[PDB]
């Protein structure tokens, strides 16, 4: 699986956690690849590096 992060660490396993940018680009990222936790994912907004 590949996400939109600069260094998508190509997470290869069953069950992958994703998060989408609110900042505009509306692209998807592996939560691992952007270093965020599920709580941070569901409770608050995420602005990616390009949309920041």
């Amino acid at each position: 699986s590949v996400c939109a992060a600069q260094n998508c660490q190509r997470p290869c396993k069953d069950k992958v956690d994703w998060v989408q940018c609110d900042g505009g680009c509306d692209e998807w990222f592996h939560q691992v690849c952007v270093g965020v936790s599920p709580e941070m994912a569901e409770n608050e907004d995420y602005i990616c590096i390009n949309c920041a």
């Binding site: 069950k15 998060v19 608050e44």
Partner: peptide, 7 residues
């Protein structure tokens, strides 16, 4: 934000 889980 919007999250997703892929299996």
């Amino acid at each position: 934000a919007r999250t997703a889980q892929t299996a």
